[PDB]
Design a protein around this motif. Structure first.
Motif, PDB file in Angstrom:
ATOM      1  N   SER A   1       0.847  -1.213   0.000  1.00  0.00           N
ATOM      2  CA  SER A   1       0.000   0.000   0.000  1.00  0.00           C
ATOM      3  C   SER A   1       0.881   1.262   0.000  1.00  0.00           C
ATOM      4  O   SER A   1       1.991   1.235   0.511  1.00  0.00           O
ATOM      5  N   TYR A   2       0.365   2.373  -0.559  1.00  0.00           N
ATOM      6  CA  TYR A   2       1.147   3.628  -0.765  1.00  0.00           C
ATOM      7  C   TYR A   2       0.545   4.807   0.032  1.00  0.00           C
ATOM      8  O   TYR A   2      -0.672   4.878   0.212  1.00  0.00           O
ATOM      9  N   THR A   3       1.412   5.732   0.496  1.00  0.00           N
ATOM     10  CA  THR A   3       1.006   6.938   1.262  1.00  0.00           C
ATOM     11  C   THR A   3       2.067   8.051   1.090  1.00  0.00           C
ATOM     12  O   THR A   3       3.264   7.805   1.272  1.00  0.00           O
ATOM     13  N   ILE A   4       1.625   9.267   0.716  1.00  0.00           N
ATOM     14  CA  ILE A   4       2.493  10.466   0.667  1.00  0.00           C
ATOM     15  C   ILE A   4       2.093  11.436   1.795  1.00  0.00           C
ATOM     16  O   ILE A   4       0.919  11.802   1.912  1.00  0.00           O
ATOM     17  N   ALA A   5       3.067  11.854   2.617  1.00  0.00           N
ATOM     18  CA  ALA A   5       2.847  12.886   3.646  1.00  0.00           C
ATOM     19  C   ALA A   5       3.334  14.257   3.128  1.00  0.00           C
ATOM     20  O   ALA A   5       4.526  14.433   2.875  1.00  0.00           O
ATOM     21  N   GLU A   6       2.410  15.225   2.965  1.00  0.00           N
ATOM     22  CA  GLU A   6       2.759  16.603   2.566  1.00  0.00           C
ATOM     23  C   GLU A   6       3.127  17.430   3.812  1.00  0.00           C
ATOM     24  O   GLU A   6       2.250  17.796   4.595  1.00  0.00           O
ATOM     25  N   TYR A   7       4.411  17.771   3.958  1.00  0.00           N
ATOM     26  CA  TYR A   7       4.905  18.528   5.125  1.00  0.00           C
ATOM     27  C   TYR A   7       4.640  20.034   4.945  1.00  0.00           C
ATOM     28  O   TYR A   7       5.365  20.726   4.231  1.00  0.00           O
ATOM     29  N   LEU A   8       3.558  20.509   5.585  1.00  0.00           N
ATOM     30  CA  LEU A   8       3.072  21.898   5.458  1.00  0.00           C
ATOM     31  C   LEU A   8       4.063  22.867   6.167  1.00  0.00           C
ATOM     32  O   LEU A   8       4.590  23.793   5.542  1.00  0.00           O
ATOM     33  N   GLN A   9       4.321  22.627   7.474  1.00  0.00           N
ATOM     34  CA  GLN A   9       5.331  23.392   8.251  1.00  0.00           C
ATOM     35  C   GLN A   9       6.184  22.445   9.130  1.00  0.00           C
ATOM     36  O   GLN A   9       5.689  21.856  10.080  1.00  0.00           O
ATOM     37  N   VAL A  10       7.481  22.336   8.824  1.00  0.00           N
ATOM     38  CA  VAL A  10       8.473  21.667   9.696  1.00  0.00           C
ATOM     39  C   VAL A  10       9.568  22.694  10.049  1.00  0.00           C
ATOM     40  O   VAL A  10      10.351  23.103   9.178  1.00  0.00           O
ATOM     41  N   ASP A  11       9.609  23.113  11.322  1.00  0.00           N
ATOM     42  CA  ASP A  11      10.410  24.272  11.767  1.00  0.00           C
ATOM     43  C   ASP A  11      10.998  24.006  13.174  1.00  0.00           C
ATOM     44  O   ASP A  11      10.232  23.774  14.123  1.00  0.00           O
ATOM     45  N   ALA A  12      12.357  24.036  13.277  1.00  0.00           N
ATOM     46  CA  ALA A  12      13.121  23.732  14.522  1.00  0.00           C
ATOM     47  C   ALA A  12      12.999  22.227  14.929  1.00  0.00           C
ATOM     48  O   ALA A  12      12.075  21.540  14.484  1.00  0.00           O
ATOM     49  N   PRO A  13      13.921  21.670  15.794  1.00  0.00           N
ATOM     50  CA  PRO A  13      13.762  20.291  16.372  1.00  0.00           C
ATOM     51  C   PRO A  13      12.530  20.094  17.317  1.00  0.00           C
ATOM     52  O   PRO A  13      12.461  19.099  18.039  1.00  0.00           O
TER      53      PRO A  13
ATOM     54  N   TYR B   1       8.935  21.455  16.354  1.00  0.00           N
ATOM     55  CA  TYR B   1       7.614  21.525  15.662  1.00  0.00           C
ATOM     56  C   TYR B   1       7.642  20.820  14.282  1.00  0.00           C
ATOM     57  O   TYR B   1       8.503  21.096  13.439  1.00  0.00           O
ATOM     58  N   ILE B   2       6.669  19.907  14.075  1.00  0.00           N
ATOM     59  CA  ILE B   2       6.424  19.221  12.787  1.00  0.00           C
ATOM     60  C   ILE B   2       4.929  19.400  12.400  1.00  0.00           C
ATOM     61  O   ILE B   2       4.060  19.432  13.271  1.00  0.00           O
ATOM     62  N   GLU B   3       4.646  19.543  11.099  1.00  0.00           N
ATOM     63  CA  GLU B   3       3.269  19.503  10.547  1.00  0.00           C
ATOM     64  C   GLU B   3       3.272  18.795   9.179  1.00  0.00           C
ATOM     65  O   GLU B   3       4.080  19.145   8.308  1.00  0.00           O
ATOM     66  N   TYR B   4       2.372  17.810   8.988  1.00  0.00           N
ATOM     67  CA  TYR B   4       2.188  17.141   7.681  1.00  0.00           C
ATOM     68  C   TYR B   4       0.717  16.746   7.431  1.00  0.00           C
ATOM     69  O   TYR B   4      -0.135  16.809   8.327  1.00  0.00           O
ATOM     70  N   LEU B   5       0.449  16.326   6.183  1.00  0.00           N
ATOM     71  CA  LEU B   5      -0.870  15.863   5.732  1.00  0.00           C
ATOM     72  C   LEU B   5      -0.742  14.423   5.205  1.00  0.00           C
ATOM     73  O   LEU B   5       0.007  14.185   4.263  1.00  0.00           O
ATOM     74  N   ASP B   6      -1.493  13.476   5.776  1.00  0.00           N
ATOM     75  CA  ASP B   6      -1.401  12.056   5.393  1.00  0.00           C
ATOM     76  C   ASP B   6      -2.412  11.759   4.256  1.00  0.00           C
ATOM     77  O   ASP B   6      -3.629  11.719   4.479  1.00  0.00           O
ATOM     78  N   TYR B   7      -1.893  11.597   3.032  1.00  0.00           N
ATOM     79  CA  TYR B   7      -2.686  11.214   1.846  1.00  0.00           C
ATOM     80  C   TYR B   7      -2.445   9.733   1.511  1.00  0.00           C
ATOM     81  O   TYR B   7      -1.309   9.349   1.220  1.00  0.00           O
ATOM     82  N   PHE B   8      -3.509   8.909   1.541  1.00  0.00           N
ATOM     83  CA  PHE B   8      -3.458   7.544   0.976  1.00  0.00           C
ATOM     84  C   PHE B   8      -3.167   7.637  -0.544  1.00  0.00           C
ATOM     85  O   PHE B   8      -3.992   8.144  -1.307  1.00  0.00           O
ATOM     86  N   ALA B   9      -1.974   7.181  -0.953  1.00  0.00           N
ATOM     87  CA  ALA B   9      -1.479   7.325  -2.337  1.00  0.00           C
ATOM     88  C   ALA B   9      -1.821   6.093  -3.208  1.00  0.00           C
ATOM     89  O   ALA B   9      -2.372   5.097  -2.723  1.00  0.00           O
ATOM     90  N   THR B  10      -1.465   6.172  -4.502  1.00  0.00           N
ATOM     91  CA  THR B  10      -1.845   5.155  -5.523  1.00  0.00           C
ATOM     92  C   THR B  10      -0.614   4.683  -6.337  1.00  0.00           C
ATOM     93  O   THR B  10       0.510   5.150  -6.107  1.00  0.00           O
ATOM     94  N   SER B  11      -0.839   3.740  -7.277  1.00  0.00           N
ATOM     95  CA  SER B  11       0.202   3.236  -8.210  1.00  0.00           C
ATOM     96  C   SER B  11       0.707   4.338  -9.179  1.00  0.00           C
ATOM     97  O   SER B  11       1.848   4.282  -9.650  1.00  0.00           O
ATOM     98  N   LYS B  12      -0.149   5.345  -9.450  1.00  0.00           N
ATOM     99  CA  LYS B  12       0.227   6.550 -10.245  1.00  0.00           C
ATOM    100  C   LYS B  12       0.961   7.615  -9.379  1.00  0.00           C
ATOM    101  O   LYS B  12       1.236   8.726  -9.851  1.00  0.00           O
ATOM    102  N   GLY B  13       1.250   7.269  -8.108  1.00  0.00           N
ATOM    103  CA  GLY B  13       1.995   8.151  -7.198  1.00  0.00           C
ATOM    104  C   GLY B  13       1.085   9.080  -6.389  1.00  0.00           C
ATOM    105  O   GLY B  13       0.887   8.860  -5.197  1.00  0.00           O
ATOM    106  N   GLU B  14       0.488  10.066  -7.102  1.00  0.00           N
ATOM    107  CA  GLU B  14      -0.296  11.219  -6.550  1.00  0.00           C
ATOM    108  C   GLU B  14      -1.093  10.915  -5.246  1.00  0.00           C
ATOM    109  O   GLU B  14      -0.608  11.192  -4.142  1.00  0.00           O
ATOM    110  N   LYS B  15      -2.313  10.359  -5.399  1.00  0.00           N
ATOM    111  CA  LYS B  15      -3.218  10.031  -4.281  1.00  0.00           C
ATOM    112  C   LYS B  15      -4.466   9.301  -4.810  1.00  0.00           C
ATOM    113  O   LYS B  15      -4.736   9.293  -6.021  1.00  0.00           O
ATOM    114  N   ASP B  16      -5.222   8.713  -3.884  1.00  0.00           N
ATOM    115  CA  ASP B  16      -6.454   7.970  -4.184  1.00  0.00           C
ATOM    116  C   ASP B  16      -7.571   8.890  -4.738  1.00  0.00           C
ATOM    117  O   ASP B  16      -8.412   8.440  -5.524  1.00  0.00           O
ATOM    118  N   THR B  17      -7.579  10.160  -4.273  1.00  0.00           N
ATOM    119  CA  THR B  17      -8.461  11.258  -4.777  1.00  0.00           C
ATOM    120  C   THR B  17      -9.911  11.187  -4.215  1.00  0.00           C
ATOM    121  O   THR B  17     -10.545  12.226  -3.990  1.00  0.00           O
TER     122      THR B  17
END
Length: 164
Positions: A68-80, A82-98
């Motif tokens: 199974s595939y998943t891309i995390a889009e890191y919106l804001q990652v700043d200093a050791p 604070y972290i921020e990301y978006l968990d998208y269930f991805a596909t065989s075409k890379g992008e996302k399930d949509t």
């Protein structure tokens, strides 16, 4: 756990025995990420990784009979701290399930005295998505993946025998 609950939002917290730098690099470096972030009897292959403000990481959960595939889009990652990301269930075409919306996590430092504690504010889609994880008991399951993280960061740490 004693962690905080909302409507479609789960606030998780966990204390890692490890210095702040490698605890951050767990979420921010692939060479560490694919050594902890995986379910039981399953591996994880990170194809590409970039954790920064406006970054992204393409990885895949390698299960016994499924990849199974998943891309995390890191919106804001700043200093050791604070972290921020978006968990998208991805596909065989890379992008996302949509056919689904983007899951939202922000992991923020709070209890930092000697051992580290980075508390994840996690906003799930809507209705009963986050609640269903409460009825499932996701709290100990997250701590089980973070058990493998604390084990990774200490390296020679091992105590988990055949669970019975």
């Amino acid at each position: 756990m004693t962690i905080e609950k909302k409507k479609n939002k789960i606030i998780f917290t966990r204390t890692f025995s490890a210095p702040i730098n490698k605890v951050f690099d767990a979420y921010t470096k692939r060479e560490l990420f694919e050594q902890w972030f995986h379910p039981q009897d399953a591996s994880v292959t990170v194809y590409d990784f970039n954790a920064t403000k406006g970054g992204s990481a393409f990885y895949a959960i390698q299960a016994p009979q499924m990849i199974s595939y998943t891309i995390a889009e890191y919106l804001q990652v700043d200093a050791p701290y604070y972290i921020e990301y978006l968990d998208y269930f991805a596909t065989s075409k890379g992008e996302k399930d949509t056919s689904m919306p983007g899951m939202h996590i922000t992991l923020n430092f709070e209890e930092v005295k000697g051992k580290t504690t980075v508390t994840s504010t996690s906003t799930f889609p809507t209705e009963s998505a986050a609640q269903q994880a409460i009825d499932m008991g996701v709290e100990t399951g997250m701590n089980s993946t973070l058990n493998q993280l604390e084990k990774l960061l200490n390296q020679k740490l091992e105590h988990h025998h055949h669970h019975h």
